[PDB]
């Protein structure tokens, strides 16, 4: 939303039908990557996603009122080894996303676990309720 003109993107992480946890207080707990915004691909190359990407998933485990529903989020946690511009390598023990409202602000009001610095700039609303940033 605000920083993607910089080095928005890193080594390949995820794919369609990839399952991630919901790290907030929204009510959703488990979600599967259903689609990728923006990206355009080529023959047989599965579409991509990593940290700080407008991503589209659906609710698999969570409150019934959100079960089997469509919502937007951003990617905050990945297991991939990758190289930061200052040449450090960051990883997250699992893969998590935070659901965002269609305007851009997160739907949830709480944040679970650390987030790589990159998401905060691309989504300052996330940084608004962000607790710790790595």
């Amino acid at each position: 939303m605000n920083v993607l003109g910089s080095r928005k993107g890193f080594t390949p992480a995820l794919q369609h039908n990839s399952s991630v946890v919901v790290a907030d207080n929204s009510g959703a707990k488990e979600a599967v990557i259903i689609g990728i915004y923006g990206y355009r691909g080529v023959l047989r190359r599965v579409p991509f996603a990593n940290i700080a990407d407008l991503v589209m998933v659906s609710v698999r485990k969570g409150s019934p009122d959100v079960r089997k529903q469509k919502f937007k989020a951003v990617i905050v946690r990945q297991r991939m080894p990758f190289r930061r511009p200052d040449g450090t390598w960051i990883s997250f023990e699992d893969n998590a996303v935070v659901i965002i409202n269609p305007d851009g602000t997160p739907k949830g009001t709480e944040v679970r676990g650390p987030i790589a610095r990159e998401a905060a700039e691309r989504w300052p609303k996330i940084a608004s309720v962000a607790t710790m940033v790595i």
Binding site: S6, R7, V42, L43, R44, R83, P85, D86, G87
Partner: protein, 339 residues
Amino acid sequence: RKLSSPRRGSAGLRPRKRADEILPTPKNWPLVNLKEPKLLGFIGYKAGMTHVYMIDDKPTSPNYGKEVYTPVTIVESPPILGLALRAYHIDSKGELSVLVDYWANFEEGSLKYLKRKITSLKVDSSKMKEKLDLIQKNLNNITYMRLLVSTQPWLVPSLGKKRPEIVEIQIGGGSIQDQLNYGLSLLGKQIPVRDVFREGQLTDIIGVTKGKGFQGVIKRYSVVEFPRWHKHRKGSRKIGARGPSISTPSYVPQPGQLGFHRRTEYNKRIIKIGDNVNEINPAGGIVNYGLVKNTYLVIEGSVLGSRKRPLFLRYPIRPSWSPESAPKITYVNLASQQG
């Protein structure tokens, strides 16, 4: 139903064959660009590579004024020993053949290194006088002026060889009369890379890539493994069809040699020209190469070709940006390439 697909493999470089001289040569030269007599390239060797720490010099860099990490290749730069001057002119039929050569090592150069590979001139008729003034007589009707130089690998134990290569470089500068005199001086002596280059320049690379042997189509042109079932059925590592008909069994991925090619490289900016071997030598002797013991060229990115290949360098043909000198550094990795 016949979805879109870019033609796979690279049709641009057909034919793909192996070079006939280990040390290639440029076929064009970037313009002199309004300056004085000096050379436009250099020779060297591929010693190894590492990663380096610098402040960004690109004024428009997104990383400007910060320390970022980047792989960097080392190029030992042994001194160059010139041989002769070659005359090119619009001859009969309006072509640019060699008018004449101008050799002189009888006045200086009691070196049998050249003798190892060429049974070169004797003192009997070292009468280049009538040759040299021929240039003077043919002055003002000359177009290009290259230079005969040789490498001195015997000053580098890393490459266990003693018969050297003699190769060429075209010189641009001010007036033609100046250039011949400029070259005339350079004969019979030794020339450092600093005599041609300075830090913060761009440089071009033409050389021979890492050979690989006869290859497979899967590897040669990155053709695709057939899906699933062929990993079990009738064969997997081949293209299915080979053309609509004998109407040109065409430029299609077919096996053959890959590597050891004459190739190209653009937009390479130097980092450091140091002279202390201890500043760059890694732990335990650089891998597969030895211990650099002459002046070296600190070039980032990747450089084509296998270790222990001569490399011939060149000014930028289509430089992306005009660089300033000295992208200063902050760290050099002396850690073992092993481990």
